[PDB]
Enzyme design. Structure first.
Site, PDB file in Angstrom:
ATOM      1  N   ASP A   1      10.392  -8.427  -9.004  1.00 33.69           N
ATOM      2  CA  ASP A   1       9.671  -9.150  -7.966  1.00 33.69           C
ATOM      3  C   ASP A   1      10.401 -10.447  -7.648  1.00 33.69           C
ATOM      4  OD1 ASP A   1       7.873  -7.092  -8.457  1.00 33.69           O
ATOM      5  OD2 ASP A   1       6.572  -8.340  -9.708  1.00 33.69           O
TER       6      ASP A   1
ATOM      7  N   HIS B   1       9.699  -5.625  -3.816  1.00 36.87           N
ATOM      8  CA  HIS B   1       9.810  -4.977  -5.114  1.00 36.87           C
ATOM      9  C   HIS B   1      10.000  -3.481  -4.917  1.00 36.87           C
ATOM     10  CE1 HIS B   1       5.565  -3.649  -4.768  1.00 36.87           C
ATOM     11  NE2 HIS B   1       5.375  -4.850  -4.250  1.00 36.87           N
TER      12      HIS B   1
ATOM     13  N   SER C   1       6.095  -6.080  -0.378  1.00 32.18           N
ATOM     14  CA  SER C   1       7.170  -5.131  -0.089  1.00 32.18           C
ATOM     15  C   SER C   1       6.928  -4.265   1.144  1.00 32.18           C
ATOM     16  CB  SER C   1       7.380  -4.235  -1.312  1.00 32.18           C
ATOM     17  OG  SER C   1       6.255  -3.398  -1.517  1.00 32.18           O
ATOM     18  N   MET C   2       5.826  -3.515   1.175  1.00 34.49           N
ATOM     19  CA  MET C   2       5.540  -2.739   2.377  1.00 34.49           C
ATOM     20  C   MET C   2       5.255  -3.668   3.550  1.00 34.49           C
ATOM     21  SD  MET C   2       5.655   0.327   3.542  1.00 34.49           S
ATOM     22  CE  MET C   2       6.256   0.679   1.895  1.00 34.49           C
TER      23      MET C   2
ATOM     24  N   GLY D   1       0.775  -1.224   0.000  1.00 33.86           N
ATOM     25  CA  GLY D   1       0.000   0.000   0.000  1.00 33.86           C
ATOM     26  C   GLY D   1       0.810   1.279   0.000  1.00 33.86           C
TER      27      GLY D   1
END
Lengths: 186, 191, 191, 186, 191, 184, 191, 191, 186, 186
Positions: free
Chosen positions: G170, G121, G96-97, G67
């Protein structure tokens, strides 16, 4: 719609009559200007223009405004229906002695309007152009009507409507007519 | 869903939401786009805490990407009016309206996280109408821009000429950069 | 979300929302576009506070961009009808309807924040129909425009010819400008 | 529509017949007016116009009204189907002796209607124009029908419908016909 | 959001919404377009108040631009059937059903704020179908128009020929004009 | 282009084809062809009608147009006819009104919608009654039955097949090939 | 619908939602896309638990597809700022986050389920405008990318150049692979 | 509307929803398309029951047409992690992800109704981008497909080569057929 | 729309007058470029181009720019209405001596704008292209207006509007005219 | 709009100048391929091709790449505006000595992109096709530019933009030109 228009266009070039009907947009400017230059190449005979528009892009009217002055043949203007701001600009392109109007015709003279969105600095630049556009249009009507620019600005603060009779006294229309026999060529 | 929290006071156990529980400790949250409705809640929260203890400081966390100027001005004018010192802590990001309140906090009580991002840009507005109306709105937005620049200079101490140059375009500022600029005082790193 | 608040009165602990807690202190909030539904709530609150204390002074904060003219008249007529003085404190913005209520407050009890903006404009209405209907509706809106000008002239004290002239186009005014105009009495800066 | 109309338009131009079917808009005015000026250049022979319109733009009707009076050949008006405020304005353009109608034709004379949204000051100006338009349209019918303008305004307060027979007594129609042989040329 | 109110009765404290608290004092609110659901609430409120005190008067505030004829008739018929006198107070607008319900109040109990606007027009209807169906519905809308005019004549005292003439087109009437017309009895200005 | 191309040969054979909903566009095209053909010669004109309905006011133009021009119009009903198509079908003389075996006919009262004040609805109601009375008088003259009989049967959708139409008086003779047509 | 759970404590029976009951045991849930609204709740929960016991560990379960970077940064900085060790357990997926908060947990207190998936990523950003504005935003997103890579190197111990290489595209990783990379410490299998 | 039920415990009457009431008896419902939000509720419910009694069995009713693979894996890993056995009664339908949880139940405690339907197929997925990204995601989905086939082989006991063949296309299986296949152990007809 | 204009192409090719009206898009570029190559094949006589656009695709405007330089006949550029950033690029393609403008023409010179959505690595590639585009366009104007590229970049930071008279001093326009008789062929 | 282009085709077929403007789709393939086969039947003279596209269907591009190699007359390729992946494939269809470019042309070389949604087995089949296509495209630019396939794959991993000057060094363009007289026919 092409075949119907194209068929009538064949005879329209013979009579030298341009019908400026509908909103003044980019597409109409290309068609109207194209017809004016074509007719000028055929001969220097006069051209009859009928204006009936509810307004639109003012920049497009500038093209038709100067195009009339650009070509050599004199353009006879016969206003019809409602001559809005953009339509009025085109109406002023013709010489006073060549500006005719019908009995039940209206003339609307209002200051230009627009929409701006973005930072304050960009809006400031837009403000200058709008002010310059307003001053430019006031001088155009002044030369065609004979009134002073200050008088136009005071009257154009809101939607200033004028009928055929009122336009004659204002200096915008030279003479009102009902039949083609009343037109006097230069 | 918003979780429920128990205070467990002397009188007994009371159920408070996660947001209301922090409000008891003089904590206010400013999240999302700034608007009249959300901003009005902050005003009431600021006033309510004033009557409870007009001496204890207030903590106003700001995580918002901006919004309406008028709504934000109601918050800034309220913080400067009330006697308590309204501390400001930037948890997340800080946009033009977001950074005006951050800078508007009490001197020496402004904070920001290490990875917090602060931005300041010109006010955004839009209007359509006649030339006369545009000339009126143009002067109004230009006047509002000057008032905003003066507020930053007052709290940051930088001259108005510099603020105008840095506010013309979007300029991001990290925690350390903001301290030198004057937007904040200290960068909270760890307890 | 609306945060809950506890009064902690002598009788015991009762939980009130942030808006209802302030209602006990003779405070009413006017936020958002003015409409029949929200305006009716203000009327109900004004009447309730009247019965609670017909001698105390009520406070009405106004932050709204305008709205229905009929809805505004219900509030204005209610404030002038009741005996208690209804103070006004403009926060944020106050357009045509918001400005009328601000000007309609009790003399000497009209306030505005330092960065508040007050705009006075003529009524905006729309209608479609036959020529006969248009002529009838045009007279009605022109009548309302005259009554509103008289209201502002009465409270502000300026002559009617100046009100109609200044309301022809949008005219923004700051706190200091409003005091000279007569829309307000004092500009609250700090406590 | 274009290509379809083009084949029919070619033969139709040779007989001097114009058909006005559908709502009166800016597009129709440009097409109809083009035929009138074209036919007028070919010869001064009469022109037959068939009107069937449930309404439309009032300003567009004015151009057709003036155009009929502008050209030299007499325009024979044969109302068919349903006429309205915009269609009736076009119907009155022809001389009384040249106004014919069919047995099942209908007529509707109602005051103009419109919508205005904006400040009270602008609405006042719009109110004046609507009133002037109503008076202008009442004098037109009063001249063609012979009734006084006060009577027209009283009857046009609401939708005033008239059949073929009632229209003759009202003065709008001169003679009802069923075959082309019943037409009397000037 | 609807605020909460505390009655603080002798038996103990109770919490009622702003609307429910006023309902205790025999007050009913009519806001928004008239429709079957909201109209049913008014009917239920009228009957409930009747049982509590069939002698004490009831006050019905009317702020609506009109609506369904059937829904309005259920309210009007209910007001006359019950024993208590249902007062009526215009708080700014009554276009079609608001004036029928404002003029259907007990004699001497129909009021209007100083700047209220009242209108009266014939009932609008919309239906599509065969010619036979159209003729049937046309008679129904013509019968309703007559019954409505009869109601105004009864309460206002004006002859039916005048009502029908005034309802052909939209007619706006101010507070003073309505008193002479017979729609209302008194114009409330101050307490 | 297909229309314009085919229209070249369509005017030589004098065969008009009415197909689809009767709208304003159809009236302009159908009326143009009829007047054009009349100017070329007075020979008969064949009309094929197939429509589920449409605007009744548009049908009036084609109705009188058939009676307005001099050449006799041969009406051939094919497919589905309705209030708008039947009105056009009744424009031709009985002796020149033919049909097909699988053709259908429908006679129903005109329908519309109105919104506004009661006074405006009353005016609209009067015109609907006059329009209904006018259509009944038209089919009565073609079918030979009294207007009351038409009104009683038209109270609801009255479907008449090719055979029932003959007994009712709406059709003169059913045919399957052009060789069975008898010119005046 | 969220089920209700009862504590059944010595003080008495109290009803808690399924999420609030776990919050008492220092458990926080991070579900769905990361945004300013949900992230503030996680922040409020973390601060509240800190005061209750600044020594007891906190368990943060993460199941999110990523997000807003600004919202996530507030959580990471908040976990590192508070004194209690914040354990992390990855259930479902970790984007990632999502993984930046999993790797940011206290050393030796990072976990993942056997079938959990972890991905990292480059940050995704979208902006449109003039050339000058594009150049400014390009530097900002590039700066955030460098800061994000530095955070992973600190908690994972891998070289900075290795992170940038693996974050360009990714890269999915399981529990066993993540342990060697350094994103986690142990993979829970059974009790 | 979810109905309310009363427990009527020794301490006193407690109002419980129909779903929460069954939760007190170690019953969990998995209804609707699987997703992160619904799946986390099941996880929280499973963990809560684990602490109350890690020895008493749990009954998980499953009726779902499938959904997110990541959300489903979090449930399966939770069931195998917690000590108490998790019975799985298949009511209605059980698609690919819905059938993986059924198979994941405790050996000998897997059930289905007589007219229940069980289907298993490949994990549906989709993605768009460049050839490099497509090749990366293709390996991920292929790797996931192998993990699911191994899970079913472990519980069902069938060889992996058979699972891949039966999962290539949609294969419906009744209660009797499932017992022979190994997806379940017994078909519940009546108590 | 084509048959009407195509019927006019018969005489449009004889006068050698191209009209650039509306937004600069992929379709207009294919049509304008076709006319230029066609006219060049007929003869090397001058070609008159009228430009009036509010903006458009920058890449589409590059075809017309090089196309003018690609063909042998000299292109006479006449400005009308609004000359936006993309339209200005087409205007600069002609020689200074062959650049003319109307009295009420406008000109706009601003830096290009665009949007990018994706990873940071992809954004860095887009950033380089936009920077190279900004420098490429500045050199085009810097060469036509006889001004240094640094001044152009400083003035093009925001919307830089110029009237017909202001453009002359800036070096963008050589001479303002009102009639075709004032044009001097090379 | 088709009618104007249709009339221009009679003159366009004389100069032998094909125009490829806009996104490459199935519709463009028919028009471009039809013109190439028609011109080939008239004579074996050279053909001038202008390519300006922002990308499109890669399979559609193969039809044009195939037709250029299929017909006998040599195709002269002139790059204008932007030459995307789909447009670059068409650019590589001509011989090196016949690949020209304008001064402000752009060239983008990126790997193909697509979307798939369905069972895992279907994705595996799609994965192989996307790889076979990427390798096929790499072997085409390699032969045209002379670089090794590995070099192209390494550079095309991300959006690779090359200006006119850079393309000459890479090997995609042979010589940059500004006027038609600078072209050298075989």
């Amino acid at each position: 719609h092409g075949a119907i228009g194209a068929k009538l266009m064949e005879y329209a070039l013979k009579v030298r009559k341009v019908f400026v009907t509908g909103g003044v947009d980019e597409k109409m400017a290309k068609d109207v200007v194209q017809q004016l230059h074509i007719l000028a190449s055929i001969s220097d005979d006069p051209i009859y223009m009928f204006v009936n528009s509810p307004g639109g892009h003012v920049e497009s009217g500038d093209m038709i405004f100067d195009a009339i002055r650009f070509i050599t043949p004199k353009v006879i203007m016969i206003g019809s229906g409602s001559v809005a701001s953009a339509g009025a600009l085109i109406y002023a392109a013709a010489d006073k002695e060549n500006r005719y109007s019908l009995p039940n015709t209206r003339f609307l003279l209002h200051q230009p309007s627009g929409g701006i969105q973005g930072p304050a600095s960009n809006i400031e630049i837009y403000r200058r152009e709008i002010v310059r556009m307003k001053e430019r249009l006031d001088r155009i009507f002044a030369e065609a009507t004979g009134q002073t620019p200050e008088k136009i600005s005071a009257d154009t603060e809101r939607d200033f409507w004028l009928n055929a009779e009122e336009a004659v006294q204002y200096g915008l229309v030279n003479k009102i007519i009902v039949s083609e026999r009343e037109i006097t060529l230069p | 869903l918003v979780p429920m929290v128990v205070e467990q006071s002397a009188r007994g156990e009371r159920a408070y939401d996660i947001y209301s529980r922090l409000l008891k400790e003089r904590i206010i949250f400013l999240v999302g786009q700034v608007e009249d409705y959300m901003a009005n809640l902050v005003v009431a929260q600021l006033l309510f805490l004033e009557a409870e203890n007009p001496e204890k400081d207030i903590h106003l966390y700001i995580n918002s990407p901006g919004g309406s100027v008028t709504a934000g001005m109601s918050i800034y004018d309220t913080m400067q009016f009330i006697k308590p010192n309204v501390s400001t802590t930037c948890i997340g990001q800080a946009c033009s309206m977001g950074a005006l309140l951050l800078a508007g906090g009490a001197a020496g009580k402004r904070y920001c996280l290490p990875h917090s991002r602060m931005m300041i840009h010109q006010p955004l507005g839009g209007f359509q109408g006649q030339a006369s109306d545009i000339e009126i709105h143009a002067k109004e937005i230009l006047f509002i821009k000057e008032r905003l620049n003066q507020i930053l200079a007052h709290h940051t101490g930088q001259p108005l000429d510099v603020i105008a140059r840095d506010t013309d375009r979007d300029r991001f500022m990290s925690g350390d950069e903001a301290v030198k600029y004057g937007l904040i005082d200290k960068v909270m790193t760890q307890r």
